[PDB]
Design a protein around this ligand. Structure first.
Ligand SMILES: CCOC(=O)C(=O)CN(CC[C@H](N)C(=O)O)C[C@H]1O[C@@H](n2cnc3c(N)ncnc32)[C@H](O)[C@@H]1O
Ligand SMILES: Nc1ncnc2c1ncn2[C@@H]1O[C@H](CSCC[C@H]([NH3+])C(=O)O)[C@@H](O)[C@H]1O
Ligand SMILES: Nc1ncnc2c1ncn2[C@@H]1O[C@H](CSCC[C@H]([NH3+])C(=O)O)[C@@H](O)[C@H]1O
Ligand SMILES: Nc1ncnc2c1ncn2[C@@H]1O[C@H](CSCC[C@H]([NH3+])C(=O)O)[C@@H](O)[C@H]1O
Lengths: 343, 343, 336, 343
């Protein structure tokens, strides 16, 4: 199948084991911004759902299908690959919606749906939008989408901005310098210090931060889910040119994302920006191996290349240069294993 | 091999991947009670190592092998299945111990050793002692042990005691009651309440606690590593009969463990008891879904049954009754998915 | 029901209960203040005291110069009031008439009716109906003391109380209480506990929105108006969080010719023997600051001299709704 | 029925409304002394129950019937007049005991049983044993008892003893003197002081106390439920002669009670004495209007007469005199309206 060909089994097992927990669905559901914004988007665009056929990709508990039901959908196919699928069936039955919602256990790449749909709904966004690579299943599901059908969310924006955080940068060495001692219980650990430094810097940092550490307005990379194909997400090249608003040391790049629901009545935005209330996605920061000095007015240019890997995640490659000085720094990060710093 | 027939590919991959990180090694090493107590056990029993052949099962960073070298071992075979093996060899070289520590990459069930050993060392203890199932590899390694050789640790004591903690119980009940809502954003979730409670209470609670919450003297279950066979750890049946010292609600059972290093010069104990300084193992508590009332003088009897599973952990069944009244509780826990409650 | 009335009037026949009421200085002092400072509404007037008890209000009316006070009391306290009238040398002015105001015959119409008919949440005990019934003896230009009553409602957050009640219900969750499985009743137990209005006081900071007010004008209203009392509400949430229920209190106003005097049982005011009342939701509602919480509190009069209370509340922005039933006759007195 | 004939409608309605609440059943159930002693009494006398026909008078939640089922009864008729009867039916089914326990809604005086029973069980004890007059229903149920049938409880002991408690006594005047003031908001209340004193002294005081307030060994009055007839409980005359152990002022009589379960295997006692752990019955004290001075060695003689009233309670008449001095005191108390003093 399409899913299995792009994912090591070991990862998929863990992934769907993870989403089989009611506690995780609860964790997502209790994020008021998320759930409220999806509900707001679906109900305020009721003309996009009333008497329509809907597909819920990865329905989990089923919450979005029930929202689609509130909006008047004629028939909702709710596909779910984890065991959560049975619980969804339970909720469908207990909410007297069996005539309207059909739970389909399995992967959307592998199940067969009987008819074309007017609209697809889903919540496939991970850290940095793309983590978990579920966006590809979302795009894959358009094989069941009627031409001129719609996608909720309709588009996704990834934002990048350079940041300064001396303490975060210093933290890595403070942790790694554990190994820089000649007699830990009589053992010289120092030979592993460089390896420890490298290991820490390959971890993207998941947490939030004060927006005051940001040194330039973000660069935006847009995925239009109506236009994009699954293959578009295998290699994501995000060039950037930052016009520095502040003078100082740039320690790395900060990441967050927005998604938009573009309905017939209105467009509704779900934002994970550090200027907005915190969500369960937080934000993500990728350090440069070496800080770059920049003056306000200078340009910081380079590339963030996201390469999809077989663990349902991405290898992140960042190259940055201060154009005015030629000072250069890069980093390569493994997004499947982020460091959760939030407290 | 013995390891692969009894272990899922997915679980083993994540396990040995997990232990491939220097940061996790740093976390274990920075547990001073653990590391210091091991070093104390090995050095104070230097005669059990002097000019001896040693096997270190799962050497990780190699720290125990270095202790064995400090104590005068002539040759140490250090077996390690994760990529950490590469790092351990780096340390063996930078510490000029190549003539004495031989790193052998691979699983102890699969590698070939050149000779039998006089003593086996390892740190195979997990949560509730048994989690991760490394004790089976530790016991499996005895095929390389000479007829009158020794094991460090030599024995392991599991301790059980009932506790009262209304707040923890109500905490979990508070979490589970989310699924009690009849109108979460208009959706009746209640049909799943029972499912939510089951899932939450199946999580052993990992943390520490004040000893005064204990309602009776602990019961001890001893595993003798010198005599026990690997197969013995597939199904562990722990009967218990507590003589209640205090009247009140028993909300569940608390678990911790001791291990002993029985050397020629001394017996050295490593304890994770709540009366002792905290370790990275903390303590473990298994909640009853419903508490049992008992009076001082009553006896609380039952069985704790541990079933080894394919995810390198245990299915826990706890059945307990207040003998005088017939008040009974039965519970099942999934040790692989614990609740980390500390700070 | 005869059964309810017997207990009611036996309860009010005890001197200790009168003492308990009298020793509420806010109540007694505020009543006295309302009557004396509007003394011209009583001076040389005819008064009816509905449910006079010990007679204290009739005595206030006498102090204000009333020419004649008919003090109606159905409990045996009526006999104690007459003792006080004699020992206070007011036989020429206070006439105790034992019996129910619905059943006695009065010699003349009155200029003003006084009474203390307020129960928990104002309406408990359904004595307001007797008060309004008594208006048959009221002159066209007559007055009522109190004249109006305001019921105040506000959403509140109080996790401690909610878990307190759930902890109690959790008893019925046991699969083996002395070997007996009680759990099949847990749903019934929760329902019962959560049907208890909680009588006590609280810190005003638990309130999550400015209160909503429902006013009953005793001068205008009919007895019949009180069998079904429908109180709609729309709260504009000031704080984000879990709404665990609705808090209730009441004010009454004595609108006299000289001044208006207010008696308040609000949590911002000194405590009275009425405290305040809270109705818990079985499931709390999450609301954000700025959201709207709308719904209805419906009071249906029953034959046990009280009301069946249905509270339905909804967060308008999410559709999260909670429904609840309270038996006002059996409250939980939490105050200590 | 005999029940409707001895109780005003108003009282019975309130009584059975009161007992229709689960919280009330719960409070009785959570009295461990009570519930546990009944369970012990029934299980330890299993030969009095195994394959027998049982009558449970006023089963409430049904708990005693379930104890009888545990002891092996072939059949239990569980009679209950409040709406609790319904909830009892639910528990019998959910506990898979419909073939052995038959819930019979109604008053034991009014329902019909299909057959005679071997043993009657009940918990009919009120304050000072006799309050609520349920013992008459219990004795009435003997119309269904086989000759040589048994009753659990089998006997009831009411204990009386003189006590000294100056503070309790003074409390009464402190409370009544509220009315002894010439200008309560301008009103002279004093004419009612005597009535207030009266009202307070007519209330039996419910609470517990230090046994050291007792001034003589108690006198015991026994009801043998096997022999007694309903009518025996309408008028209960308890003569007493106390031999004073301590010198001082006697302020009244303290009351408590025991019941005994006289089975074929053993006798089990349920005691509410102030020397025993507290129960929901506490103890009861009836004050004398005027205290009596007694010397150690003096005799305090008199009568406690309990007269049943239609409010399902008793009018208590107590007359006592110190024989050596002739000083005399009386009190008339209404057990229906006690003062709950316990704090
Ligand atoms: C929570 C406290 O509740 C209260 O405020 C009251 O009910 C006030 N209480 C006490 C107030 C008292 N007057 C005082 O201020 O001293 C009501 C009194 O009115 C009597 N009564 C109730 N119905 C009655 C009826 N149809 N006909 C005649 N009498 C009635 C009652 O027997 C009682 O004596
Ligand atoms: N290819 C796939 N096919 C089906 N379900 C999937 C797939 N990939 C991920 N999922 C599920 O999609 C869900 C993403 S989480 C969103 C769940 C739910 N719609 C909610 O908003 O609460 C998880 O339950 C995953 O198990
Ligand atoms: N069957 C096995 N064979 C070899 N190594 C193993 C096996 N099971 C676990 N391990 C490794 O053993 C280690 C357990 S942690 C103990 C490491 C070291 N003794 C120290 O105290 O620092 C990890 O590095 C695991 O990867
Ligand atoms: N005459 C009567 N007939 C039937 N039930 C009665 C009668 N009098 C009292 N009861 C009930 O008897 C119970 C008294 S206490 C509850 C006793 C129960 N067996 C237990 O141990 O928990 C109440 O449920 C009353 O409603």
């Amino acid at each position: 199948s399409v899913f299995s060909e792009r994912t090591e089994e070991s990862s998929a097992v863990q992934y769907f084991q993870f989403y089989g927990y009611l506690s995780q669905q609860q964790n997502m559901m209790q994020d008021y911004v998320r759930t409220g914004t999806y509900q707001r988007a679906i109900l305020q665009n009721h003309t996009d759902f009333k008497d329509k056929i809907v597909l819920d990709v990865g329905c989990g508990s089923g919450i979005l299908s029930f929202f689609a039901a509130q909006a008047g959908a004629r028939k909702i196919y709710a596909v779910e690959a984890s065991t959560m699928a049975q619980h969804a069936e339970v909720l469908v039955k207990s909410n007297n919606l069996t005539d309207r919602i059909v739970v389909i256990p399995g992967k959307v790449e592998e199940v067969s749906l009987p008819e074309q749909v007017d609209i697809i709904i889903s919540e496939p966004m991970g850290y940095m939008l793309f983590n978990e690579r579920m966006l590809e299943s979302y795009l894959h599901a358009k094989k069941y989408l009627k031409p001129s059908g719609n996608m909720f969310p309709t588009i996704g924006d990834v934002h990048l901005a350079p940041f300064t955080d001396e303490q975060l940068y210093m933290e890595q060495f403070t942790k790694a310098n554990f190994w820089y001692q000649p007699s830990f219980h009589g053992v010289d650990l120092s030979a592993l210090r460089g390896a420890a430094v490298d290991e820490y810097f390959r971890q993207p940092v998941v947490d939030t931060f004060d927006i005051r550490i940001l040194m330039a307005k973000s660069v935006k990379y847009t995925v239009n889910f109506l236009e994009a194909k699954e293959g578009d997400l295998h290699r994501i090249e995000i060039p950037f040119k930052f016009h520095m608003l502040h003078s100082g040391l740039v320690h790395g790049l900060a990441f967050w994302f927005d998604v938009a629901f573009i309905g017939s009545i209105m467009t509704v935005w779900l934002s994970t920006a550090p200027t907005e209330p915190l969500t369960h996605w937080y934000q993500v920061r990728c350090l440069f191996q070496s800080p770059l000095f920049a003056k306000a007015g200078d340009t910081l240019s380079g590339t963030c290349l996201l390469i999809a890997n077989k663990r349902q995640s991405y290898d992140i490659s960042i190259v940055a240069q201060v154009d005015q000085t030629g000072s250069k720094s890069s980093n390569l990060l493994d997004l499947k294993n982020p460091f959760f710093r939030y407290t």
